[PDB]
Design a protein around this nucleic acid. Structure first.
Length: 57
DNA sequence: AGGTAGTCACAGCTGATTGCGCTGAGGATTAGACGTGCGATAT
């Protein structure tokens, strides 16, 4: 299902607020569904940072 | 000795990724009292 969000003005200045906020539980559930497991997500972020280091070098 | 498989000079495409434009809030940047001066005027 689509994930809803709340457009809440930032507690800081009125410079550019109106930030979107999502429920943490829904985001975690969606991430687990997409990636299968938390270990897969950890491996994905590790290989992403490794690729970032490879690209910068 | 013959055939072909990479390989490099470009070019194209794709999928991402991350990177700056979108404004807005908390901190450093000359006309009345007071005198004079002068001229018309009390003793």
């Amino acid at each position: 299902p689509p994930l809803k969000f709340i457009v809440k003005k930032n507690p800081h200045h009125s410079q550019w607020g109106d930030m979107k906020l999502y429920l943490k539980l829904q985001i975690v559930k969606r991430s687990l569904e997409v990636w299968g497991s938390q270990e897969a997500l950890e491996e994905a972020k590790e290989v992403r940072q490794e690729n970032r280091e490879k690209m910068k070098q």
